[PDB]
């Protein structure tokens, strides 16, 4: 059930197909959740996407605090900080040398059926 570093596993390569790969490191990804001024919700912002303050250096903003965020479209939107949640993830390396940082549910042991 538990996946550890150095373990050979099976996961989807960037080309979309499953291949054996090796977990080279267990990382911790911190995602920010915010409510945009129009009411829409985002649950996967990175600390760096907050452009109204420097979260990478001083931590997440306070609950409900007003912030500006740089969205995936390169634009800046006003919003309110909701919460922060660190997620344990897996950095995997395939035979060709490419790597990906994936979630637990995207990793499989050699003995289990796919998908």
Swiss-Prot record:
Positions of the Tudor domain: 1-58, 59-115
Expression sites by tissue: Ubiquitous.
Effect on the protein upon substituting residue 71 to H: Abolishes binding to H3K4me3
Organism name: Homo sapiens
Record-marked site positions (Histone H3K4me3 binding): 49, 71, 77
Stated name of the protein: Lysine-specific demethylase 4A
Superkingdom, taxonomy of origin: Eukaryota
Family per record: Belongs to the JHDM3 histone demethylase family.
Cystine pairs: none
Assembly and interaction partners: Interacts with histone deacetylase proteins HDAC1, HDAC2 and HDAC3. Interacts with RB and NCOR1. Interacts with VRK1. Interacts with FBXO22; this interaction promotes KDM4A ubiquitination. (Microbial infection) Interacts with HTLV-1 Tax protein.
Annotated domain remarks: The 2 Tudor domains recognize and bind methylated histone H3 'Lys-4' residue (H3K4me). Double Tudor domain has an interdigitated structure and the unusual fold is required for its ability to bind methylated histone tails. Trimethylated H3 'Lys-4' (H3K4me3) is bound in a cage of 3 aromatic residues, 2 of which are from the Tudor domain 2, while the binding specificity is determined by side-chain interactions involving residues from the Tudor domain 1. The Tudor domains are also able to bind trimethylated histone H3 'Lys-9' (H3K9me3), di- and trimethylated H4 'Lys-20' (H4K20me2 and H4K20me3).
Complete-protein stretch covered: 897 to 1011 of 1064
UniProt subcellular location: Nucleus
Post-translational modification: Ubiquitinated by RNF8 and RNF168 following DNA damage, leading to its degradation. Degradation promotes accessibility of H4K20me2 mark for DNA repair protein TP53BP1, which is then recruited. Also ubiquitinated by the SCF(FBXO22) complex; leading to proteasomal degradation.
Function: Histone demethylase that specifically demethylates 'Lys-9' and 'Lys-36' residues of histone H3, thereby playing a central role in histone code. Does not demethylate histone H3 'Lys-4', H3 'Lys-27' nor H4 'Lys-20'. Demethylates trimethylated H3 'Lys-9' and H3 'Lys-36' residue, while it has no activity on mono- and dimethylated residues. Demethylation of Lys residue generates formaldehyde and succinate. Participates in transcriptional repression of ASCL2 and E2F-responsive promoters via the recruitment of histone deacetylases and NCOR1, respectively.
Coiled-coil stretches noted in the UniProt entry, renumbered to this chain: none
